[PDB]
């Protein structure tokens, strides 16, 4: 994949050596060209995947994320230069450099043919992510969130790190393809229980699974517009991709192990969904959208049926496009009313005619408006889940019903009503905003023309 | 609280419509409105305050068992169809300054006349507050009254927002 | 209690400008001054061609609207649909299905040339 | 709503006729400055009937307080036009 790796790398020299006032000019154009080249990976085959070298490999499960992944990067640069303008060149380039690195740390993450390699590259991502939030976060009020990251590594990565290394000695190697022929049954024994958790626990923090989700809502309070979009667009999907990946060597032990997760996952949806209503914060509810959505993916993986994995592939792609759009949509107010308060501003339709359109257009996909990909996946989950147990239908039935509530609550609470009288700075929608948003819905809808690509290797 | 006197008037004002709702027909309602009028006339001369307290209490429970489930409502009031039905068509007066010059130049009469609102908004700004400073109770206003201007050709204090509000039917 | 002396004059103080605040909304006749915009030659002919009026002249304008849309939006898609079915959908097996025609007594076939038997001898009821 | 516009002067004659339809209001005692309590001798009970008649004469409901302070036709004229945005 060197063809994709290096062009991103040289963008770092591009930032430093480009015309000081053209840093935004070159970056988008140069980065965008890479996005067009991203398509070439889609040369998929029916049976065998696309394997280049001993390190990098791509397939249907990872292909759409790669194409999706790069797509985000130019948008993050777009959304930021308004408030990065306040920053100076000496410290401004520091913002782009980190983002460029995270692209390298991501594309290689989804193409790592060796799990440790996957783990390594995956681990480093927190450094670009954290430094993006911490140093250049609008809030620096000592939220003390170090506990969560301290907890995460203690219960997550570190046991996972040991877990991986234990496998390599036993089986012989950790190449993902190699396990496809040497994986062995994992009988029910006390030791394997602990291996199973470590092999799964780390991702659950990042999906995030129910009970571990306390950290995500607070992030978007601190993280600026740039950091937020990638967090749910990309970083959350890491866990799903790994879980879909590592689960090749957890049979048949995963069966009984799954239930404790599934109940959290299945029940968590309604709890997480309804909590959306009481979220007074724009970014929190937007964050909560992911919490309930991903829970579907987790269950699809645990039931581990051929049909289910298709839904997660479609669902994983589907949600990321939406929420990433939503952050900017809600953030678009933060750059005007200088806060995340949902209730403070209302009736944006009259003062921003088009903007209410995007809220309408994006909200539908959240509530699974057919035939959008969102329903294609979400519906596929219902089909696969129902076979697992018919009783599961009710939780899906209520959750979807709940989904429409917040799907339209903000669209109502903000796009309608009297304009707040004391508010007098509501400026016309900017070209940057108009174009930037359009980049999201278009491909999200256009994927409906050819959803086949995002059906995972199962299809 | 509204004091004792106001409550009867507010109740008497509200009482008729529900009666009219049940009777409906003008002549029929007019008949029993006079019979209803024949009530509050009897207790018009009541003086003893506690005596007046008990009588009005009955008009609450008594009214509570006469109220129509679907009384007639003027559409442009709460409970009416035309409430919050044209708010969006009203527009802030402060959005003009963001207008592109193409839009602005189309209305030379308007803006030149607007400048006599902003100018009238700022030139009268300093004086009006000083009018309120000495006209404001010490330590915080006791009541929410707004005193008028007290000179020749003086704008009322805090006038801009009320005057500059939209029109009921803008288009 | 009627409007107090402060209330009585104050409303007029504001009502003077509230009403005048409606007077600024008065619009110049030239408005809304907007660019002429291009007029494609398709419009140009019919701007003057239809100003005379009357029944006869503007029906062809009505028929033009009906005729132009007919070819573009009726005759074109129907042509298009024909080719799609006639050479791409039918060519696949079990693509376009049709409930088979009903068969009644004494009907002759064309592919086979065979004729169905009539019905039995009715009892000749009072009918 | 087609185009039934209204004018400040027009509301005045409407007010009088509503005040003419009041039996107690003598035609010769009916005038713009005729204070209900004093010039017309109309008390709160009488005034509410007029306001109720006015509410049916303009298709807009007057709140509780806005019917109390109207003890003369001029206040009503100063009141109706302000409500209905009538400028000319």
């Amino acid at each position: 994949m060197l063809k994709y790796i290096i062009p991103t790398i040289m963008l770092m020299p591009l930032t430093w050596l480009s015309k000081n006032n053209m840093i935004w000019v070159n970056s988008t154009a140069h980065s965008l060209l890479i996005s067009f080249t991203s398509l070439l990976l889609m040369n998929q085959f029916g049976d065998n995947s696309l394997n280049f070298s001993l390190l990098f490999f791509s397939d249907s499960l990872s292909t759409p994320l790669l194409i999706l992944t790069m797509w985000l990067l130019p948008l993050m640069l777009m959304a930021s230069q308004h408030h990065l303008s306040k920053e100076n060149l000496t410290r401004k380039k520091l913002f782009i450099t980190m983002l460029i690195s995270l692209q390298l740390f991501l594309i290689m993450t989804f193409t790592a043919m060796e799990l440790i390699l996957f783990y390594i590259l995956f681990e480093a991502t927190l450094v670009p992510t954290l430094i993006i939030i911490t140093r250049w976060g609008n809030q620096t009020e000592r939220l003390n969130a170090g506990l969560y990251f301290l907890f995460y590594t203690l219960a997550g990565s570190l046991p996972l790190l040991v877990a991986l290394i234990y496998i390599q000695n036993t089986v012989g190697s950790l190449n993902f393809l190699m396990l496809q022929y040497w994986v062995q049954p994992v009988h029910n024994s006390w030791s394997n229980v602990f291996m199973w958790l470590a092999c799964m626990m780390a991702f659950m923090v990042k999906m995030p699974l129910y009970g571990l989700h306390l950290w995500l809502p607070k992030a978007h309070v601190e993280a600026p517009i740039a950091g937020s979009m990638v967090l749910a667009a990309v970083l959350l999907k890491l866990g799903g991709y790994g879980m879909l990946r590592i689960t090749l060597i957890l049979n048949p032990m995963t069966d009984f192990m799954a239930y404790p997760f599934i109940m959290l996952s299945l029940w968590g949806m309604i709890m997480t969904s309804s909590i959306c209503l009481r979220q007074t914060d724009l970014k929190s509810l937007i964050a909560y959208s992911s919490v309930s959505h991903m829970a579907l993916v987790i269950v699809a993986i645990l039931i581990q049926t051929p049909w289910s994995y298709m839904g997660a592939t479609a669902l994983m792609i589907a949600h990321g496009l939406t929420s990433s759009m939503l952050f900017c949509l809600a953030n678009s107010n933060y750059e005007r009313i200088h806060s995340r308060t949902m209730i403070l501003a209302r009736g944006l339709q009259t003062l921003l005619p088009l903007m209410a359109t995007w809220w309408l257009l994006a909200s539908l996909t959240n509530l699974a408006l057919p035939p959008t990909i969102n329903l294609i996946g979400e519906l596929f989950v219902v089909m696969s889940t129902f076979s697992w147990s018919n009783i599961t239908i009710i939780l899906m039935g209520v959750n979807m019903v709940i989904t429409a509530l917040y799907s339209l609550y903000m669209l109502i609470m903000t796009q309608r009503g009297k304009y707040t009288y004391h508010i007098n700075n509501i400026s016309p929608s900017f070209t940057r905003e108009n174009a930037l948003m359009s980049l999201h819905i278009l491909p999200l809808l256009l994927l409906t023309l050819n959803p086949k690509i995002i059906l995972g290797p199962l299809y | 609280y509204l004091t004792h006197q106001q409550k009867v008037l507010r109740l008497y004002k509200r009482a008729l419509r529900h009666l009219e709702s049940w009777c409906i027909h003008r002549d029929k309602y007019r008949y029993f409105a006079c019979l209803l009028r024949a009530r509050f006339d009897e207790h018009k001369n009541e003086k003893d305050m506690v005596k007046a307290t008990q009588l009005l209490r009955e008009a609450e429970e008594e009214f509570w068992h006469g109220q129509h489930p679907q009384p007639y409502i003027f559409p442009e009031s709460p409970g009416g169809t035309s409430y919050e039905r044209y708010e969006c068509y009203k527009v802030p007066e402060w959005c003009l300054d963001d207008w592109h010059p193409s839009e602005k130049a189309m209305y030379p009469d308007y803006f030149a006349k607007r400048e006599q609102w902003k100018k009238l908004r700022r030139e009268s700004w300093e004086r009006e507050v000083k009018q309120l400073q000495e006209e404001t109770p010490v330590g915080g206003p006791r009541t929410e009254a707004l005193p008028p201007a007290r000179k020749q050709g003086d704008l009322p204090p805090l006038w801009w927002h009320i005057v500059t509000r939209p029109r009921e039917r803008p288009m | 209690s009627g409007y107090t002396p402060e209330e009585k004059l104050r409303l007029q103080q504001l009502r003077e400008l509230r009403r005048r605040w409606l007077k600024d909304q008065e619009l110049s006749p030239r408005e809304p001054v907007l660019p002429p915009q291009r007029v494609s030659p398709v419009e140009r002919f019919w701007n003057k061609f239809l100003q005379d009026g009357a029944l006869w002249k503007n029906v062809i304008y009505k028929t033009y609207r009906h005729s132009i849309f007919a070819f573009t939006h009726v005759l074109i898609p129907v042509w298009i649909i024909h080719y799609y079915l006639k050479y791409h959908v039918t060519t696949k097996p079990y693509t376009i299905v049709e409930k088979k025609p009903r068969i009644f007594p004494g009907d002759t076939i064309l592919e086979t040339g065979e004729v169905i038997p009539p019905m039995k001898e009715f009892p000749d009821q009072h009918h | 709503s087609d185009a039934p516009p209204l004018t400040l002067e027009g509301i005045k004659d409407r007010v009088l006729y509503v005040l003419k339809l009041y039996d107690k209001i003598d035609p010769e005692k009916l005038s713009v400055n005729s204070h209900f309590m004093k010039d017309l001798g109309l008390d709160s009970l009488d005034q509410v009937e007029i306001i109720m008649a006015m509410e049916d004469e303009f298709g807009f409901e007057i709140p509780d307080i806005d019917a109390e302070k109207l003890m003369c036709p001029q206040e009503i004229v100063d009141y109706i036009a302000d409500k209905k945005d009538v400028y000319e």
């Binding site: 016309p428 | 527009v91 959005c95 | - | 185009a3 516009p5």
Partner: peptide, 17 residues
Amino acid sequence: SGDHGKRLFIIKPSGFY
């Protein structure tokens, strides 16, 4: 519309952009 003049002003955000 139904009368000479009486053309009411239009207030909106700057749509030129």
